[PDB]
Amino acid sequence: DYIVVKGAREHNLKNIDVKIPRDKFVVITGLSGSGKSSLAFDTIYAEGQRRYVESLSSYARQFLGQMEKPDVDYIDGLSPAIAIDQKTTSRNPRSTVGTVTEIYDYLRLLFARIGTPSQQTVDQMVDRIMEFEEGTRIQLLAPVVRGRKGEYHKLIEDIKKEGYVRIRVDGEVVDVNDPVNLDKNKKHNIEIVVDRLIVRPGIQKRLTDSIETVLRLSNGILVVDVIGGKEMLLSQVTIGGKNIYEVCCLSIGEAKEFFANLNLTERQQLIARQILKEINARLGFLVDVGLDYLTLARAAGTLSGGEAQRIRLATQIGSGLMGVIYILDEPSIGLHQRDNDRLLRSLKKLRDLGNTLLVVEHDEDTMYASDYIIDLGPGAGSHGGQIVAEGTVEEIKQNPNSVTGEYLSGRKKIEVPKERRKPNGKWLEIIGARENNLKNINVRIPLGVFTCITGVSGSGKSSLINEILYKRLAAELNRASVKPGEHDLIKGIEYLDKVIDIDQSPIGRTPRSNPATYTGVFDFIREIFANTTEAKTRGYKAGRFSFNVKGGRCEACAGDGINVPCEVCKGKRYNRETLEVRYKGKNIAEVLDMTVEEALEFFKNIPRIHKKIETLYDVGLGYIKLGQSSTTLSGGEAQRVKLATELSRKSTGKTMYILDEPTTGLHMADVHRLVGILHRLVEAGNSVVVIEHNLDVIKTADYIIDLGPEGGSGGGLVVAEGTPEEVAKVENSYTGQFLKKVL
Amino acid sequence: DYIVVKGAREHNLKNIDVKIPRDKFVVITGLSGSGKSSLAFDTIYAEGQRRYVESLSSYARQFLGQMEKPDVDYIDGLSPAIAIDQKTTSRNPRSTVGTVTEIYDYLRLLFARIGTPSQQTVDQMVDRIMEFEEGTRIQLLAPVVRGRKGEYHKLIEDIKKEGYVRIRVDGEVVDVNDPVNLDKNKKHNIEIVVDRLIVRPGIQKRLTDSIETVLRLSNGILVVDVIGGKEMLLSQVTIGGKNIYEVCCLSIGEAKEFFANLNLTERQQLIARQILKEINARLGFLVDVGLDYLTLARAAGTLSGGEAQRIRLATQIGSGLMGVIYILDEPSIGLHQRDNDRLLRSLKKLRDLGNTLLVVEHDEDTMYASDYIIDLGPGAGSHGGQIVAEGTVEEIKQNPNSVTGEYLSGRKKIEVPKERRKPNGKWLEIIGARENNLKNINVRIPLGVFTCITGVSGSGKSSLINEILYKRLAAELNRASVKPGEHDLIKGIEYLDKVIDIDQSPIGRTPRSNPATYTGVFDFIREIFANTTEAKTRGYKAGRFSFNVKGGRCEACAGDGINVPCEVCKGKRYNRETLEVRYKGKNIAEVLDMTVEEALEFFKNIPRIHKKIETLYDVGLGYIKLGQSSTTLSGGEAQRVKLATELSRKSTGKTMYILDEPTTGLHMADVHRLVGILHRLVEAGNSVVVIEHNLDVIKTADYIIDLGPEGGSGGGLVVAEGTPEEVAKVENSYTGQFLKKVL
DNA sequence: CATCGTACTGTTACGGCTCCATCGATGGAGCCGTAACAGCGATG
DNA sequence: CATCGTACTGTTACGGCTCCATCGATGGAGCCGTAACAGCGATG
Ligand SMILES: Nc1ncnc2c1ncn2[C@@H]1O[C@H](COP(=O)(O)OP(=O)(O)NP(=O)(O)O)[C@@H](O)[C@H]1O
Ligand SMILES: Nc1ncnc2c1ncn2[C@@H]1O[C@H](COP(=O)(O)OP(=O)(O)NP(=O)(O)O)[C@@H](O)[C@H]1O
Ligand SMILES: Nc1ncnc2c1ncn2[C@@H]1O[C@H](COP(=O)(O)OP(=O)(O)NP(=O)(O)O)[C@@H](O)[C@H]1O
Ligand SMILES: Nc1ncnc2c1ncn2[C@@H]1O[C@H](COP(=O)(O)OP(=O)(O)NP(=O)(O)O)[C@@H](O)[C@H]1O
Ligand SMILES: [Mg+2]
Ligand SMILES: [Mg+2]
Ligand SMILES: [Zn+2]
Ligand SMILES: [Zn+2]
């Protein structure tokens, strides 16, 4: 009935007790960094997996592996759990859609089980001959030589001595006793005539005996000579007329149609019902989410973000179970509203089978389509990790201590601008863009305003922007050695002086990385430290103060601090001599131990450091430490670190900003902060282009370039273009339909 | 609170609903073949394992594997389950006790984690030098050449050009500027003097700088020359003074003592607490059950039945968990009463940790030491598979519908004989028996009476009987080519004419085996069928009617009948022509489809077949089919088939019967049947020797030869010898102590 | 001590069948640190 | 058209570190089927 958790203390959680209803659609909600992932994935799934694994052999435990033991007193009401991680995976080039979805294994099993390559037994042969009409004259032959050249005299003598008298050679029956002649260089088909029977009921015994002796003499080969009829031969991989490659070269929808109407007998059904059911469920889920155009032979590395996310989901939740907790960590990454609604319908269908759904989400549609909501807060980092509200959507909305309820209820909102900026005659015209699935379209992107590129997941917006416009602009301005996509020409590059791009790619997590190193400010800090008088006296350089460089780092901990915390250097990753150069009475370890807000006051005089620290504060990461390990960063925190890294660069007043879905893992407040930053950048005279699926960002855009009307080969055309109201007035545009209810 | 099972239909179960209390000692009870194993192992454990496995990846599912899906409507209250199978396992010769118990892996991890092979950092070297007293004169050296021969002129010139002036050669300090001479064929130790410091507080910076430059110049080698003191060298697997082989060559008790008082610092404890805890738990369980004499390097194939069973238990239940169902299928195989009591104490300790115990048992001590009892019956095979009684021990005893309650309450019992047979001057004297752990004892075994060999598990009774007496008797009488054990001589063999032995070994389960083939009566049946007139007319032989021979078996099913049941031959494993030779109007398939009681009436005229069928009926297997697959036979049924096979042989009135614990897997009624058969054999003038642990069998024996007083190196001596009352009068004999409460 | 009588029982080798125990590495991608390269004004 | 000014910013190649995806076989033992081998009586 309930999953009772008491005394949860993982990461930033503070002894929180929660009762999660079972067999319900439960949504975990909070600010970015509050501890939803630590509450669900790091506690509930971790404990369930640990309990299941601990009852296994040492070989199995080593092969599978278990996560770290959570700091929870006791958790009850558990069951088998299937979890989808928040982090996106990068796949090998050899990987395939069918291999990732695991339909290839089921296809291989089906082909090895029921794939038809004639193997007949004695009884089957007897029945086959019995199928003939009564009165037909037949002869049973035992071919000893089939396609060979030789004198064949000893063999004939042995056959005659065995007892057989009738032998047919070259299709003519001759007596073995009478001498015969045959060319040694000419192929001959020597066959022994065993019996000359008649077809009538009641000769089963004699026919079976003759077939048995023929099979014994000819080693499993029987030839039935039908007098006046066509001769037949009896001896001891495609399904439905399609090979494995042929069935793997079809679309998902066509494969589902083929597997839905294939003709199978009772034996084949009883043999492969389970495999057919698994394949049907997987293909049905793939068609339901919207991936009915991809072929099963497509490489998984070439898929877009939304398609990759949907295939990752289909790998785990493709075939539903019963009595299993499903933990999904933001399954709506890079998905349009339509795709999110289809996923929600699939999730409700999965829950209706008798499953518990524990979905961590930042979306509002999931919030409105949820039975129960658990709110965490009231802040992020050390200021969160405790439940601030609980109940249904309405109770959360009426709750004054929940920020997400405040944003849902309209108390806090992102204002829709009263007046939108208009283009001033400067445009970027892309002519003949035919990259990937684009259909030779001409797109004009206004300069100096806020532009949003909208469209369904897979419609061709990343390929239009990142693969063509950004690459051409980089080659023109930054002199990068990258080749752009397929296009005729781009006009209007002379109006720009720089390009800054944030891509839609995973962020690498390493123990050698932290916000300071990622943003590039640690280099300035190290140079400042190495420029002091003490470092000059001791002959130190910038690499001495790096914990990844074996010049001043502690060798006991190998620069990591933990081997169990280190004791010689106290886990600070620096030896005692390095931790003596002090800038403003503070060494490098305490500088790394500062928060962003503290570093704002400490480094308020150095402009290069101050700009980056101010950007990190602006994206809302003021609570984070400058030296926190990147492996211990959340998805939203890592995304915001990347955003600050790219947005803390110099602006000349004519630069172009390109962002590829920068909202991933961001709560509605972080979206507000990002929107404010972007609009300030635009007001400074720059131009910002955002490939976005969020309606809160979209409704504040001055220009919108919709793409579609579908994904894959069904997309690649501009379906709407103009201000958000004009796009909303378009009937056939999905983004306009969803904007009509927002504006 | 409860594990609710509804609609269980696995094997012979008939829609039984059971509520098993949780966190209790629950014992499953019934006749042999009633369906206890199918109820527990084939339903509850199977469903739990299937549910846990289905939530895993395809790779993991293939690597681990899952059992067949049970025919159960729904089962609730499940949790992770650890199960010990009833079947005994045969291990490879290379296997070891430590490897089987899985202590070897933990030992390897401990040695790889904390095993000490001097790796020092700069700070550690500085601290070590600072440990010296104040005022001491030291010199830092960088040895560039250590044990080499050469002219060494370019190296000296390079060192001088670098800046260093002081170089010590052959232990004498010389100036690099002044010319020096050295033999090219003589080894020289060239060392560069870097600094000549003093020991006082406040020289940490200079000392660290000198150590760093010395380490850089000499590539991680530092030599500290203490003036007036012993020189020391600083540079950049045994635990507790014992190697891995040394710690693996100790006894289990000594290893536990060593691991209980080993000296470890805080770092080592924080590193390997989990490994130490696992090793301590495993060794504590091994000592508790009674295996405190085996060394961890002993081969597992040389262990006795009880030791092997205890080690198999310790593999799974050695380290306890919490909230886990433990399913044990007869864990008291080949164990004395004392060992069974120790195992019961361990099981109660395991249950007190918060675990559910589901123990299938035939013993009475387990019944009396159980919180809840579930009784199945009222018979075996198709006559059982339904719950006939339920409740505590007293309720079961008062229940009139439970046979086990009847035997517990004394309503049904095995009578103790009023008068015991006395030896008639014929004895079998074994002189100088020193096989295995025997201590050169002389044992006299009376002839013509019922003799029982008793003793603790491991005391040396199987080695005394099977390895010496049976092998010598076989070599003397049956002319077998087997070498006996270590003994001087055996007297009295001239009083015997034959020997029949039932060994304590596993029974192989193959699809090609059934009771008819195992007992050897199928050969007679096949000969009878091949001797008919129809088979003579069709030229058939005895191998034609064998389903394992490719002469008359169906090739579609390959003689197995199932490929999904076969359709051409209807799964009968014979082709249509073979199923036409009828003996008394019945072919081979219906003969194989007979029960033992049916075959008693059908074959009542053929004496050779009738004797074997009558023996199979006598051991109580009248409900079984003559052709039931051996893979679908229970442990008790297989044991009884083996017993009937060996006891259905000719008796000359002077044969010797040797049985090595024939009670394994037998309920108290099957024991009564076996005791009656054995006593009839003895009354026919034969002699029976039984190595038994069952008190019901023991109390009916005319003579008893106790062995002990312990197992392993602590046993091998006769502690009692005489009638059961005389043995009961012995104070130091465990068997006498347990018999005192029975007689 | 020789002769006769309507195809005899029990126990072992040997080949074929089947079940069960026992046992990380390589390439790809992202990131950090370091080296390398390009890019107002006044007077005679 | 030449001259002067108290160690300058931003973006790319390249090597080293680290995380993550992806992928049955062999010997031993037991059993079955087949071939192989050993083992009263009366008369002259
Ligand atoms: N291993 C760790 N040790 C200590 N703190 C951690 C660790 N991992 C994460 N944190 C911090 O704990 C807080 C909560 O992290 P997490 O539970 O991942 O957040 P989240 O709610 O899933 N946020 P997001 O996914 O961005 O919406 C953040 O401040 C993290 O930086
Ligand atoms: N390298 C490639 N080769 C072939 N087809 C590709 C390749 N990359 C992408 N595609 C396809 O091109 C179409 C558009 O993908 P893309 O333009 O990258 O995505 P998008 O429209 O931005 N969608 P998303 O990022 O998920 O919201 C999809 O059908 C992709 O599968
Ligand atoms: N796979 C099977 N299919 C059909 N019947 C089976 C199968 N396995 C076992 N049986 C029969 O089902 C009955 C119960 O078997 P099982 O559940 O193993 O008994 P059990 O109570 O554990 N007996 P035992 O272990 O000897 O004390 C017996 O008559 C078996 O012969
Ligand atoms: N091949 C062997 N080499 C060395 N020791 C052995 C061997 N076989 C058995 N032992 C040991 O000899 C002792 C007696 O074993 P054994 O006589 O076979 O058992 P048992 O007394 O009949 N006990 P059990 O059958 O379990 O009730 C035990 O300590 C065994 O570990
Ligand atoms: Mg998260
Ligand atoms: Mg059983
Ligand atoms: Zn250290
Ligand atoms: Zn068949």
Side-chain angles (χ1 to χ4, degrees), chain B residues 27-31 34 36 359-361 367 373-377 404 667:
Chain B
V27 156
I28 311 188
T29 301
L31 254 177
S34 62
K36 331 176 272 300
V359 182
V360 185
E361 199 56 71
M367 285 168 185
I373 293 192
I374 292 156
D375 212 298
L376 292 127
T404 99
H667 194 245

Side-chain angles (χ1 to χ4, degrees), chain A residues 524-526 528-533 535-540 542-549 551-559 561-562 564-566:
Chain A
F524 303 142
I525 298 168
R526 289 198 275 114
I528 281 194
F529 263 82
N531 257 269
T532 63
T533 165
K536 284 174 185 167
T537 293
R538 300 173 192 211
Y540 290 164
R544 175 85 184 201
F545 306 94
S546 168
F547 58 98
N548 305 319
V549 175
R553 78 183 172 173
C554 182
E555 300 183 355
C557 34
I562 36 178
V564 47
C566 208

Side-chain angles (χ1 to χ4, degrees), chain B residues 508 512-513 517-518 526 543 546 548:
Chain B
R512 327 167 62 225
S513 195
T517 63
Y518 202 94
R526 289 199 275 114
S546 168
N548 305 319

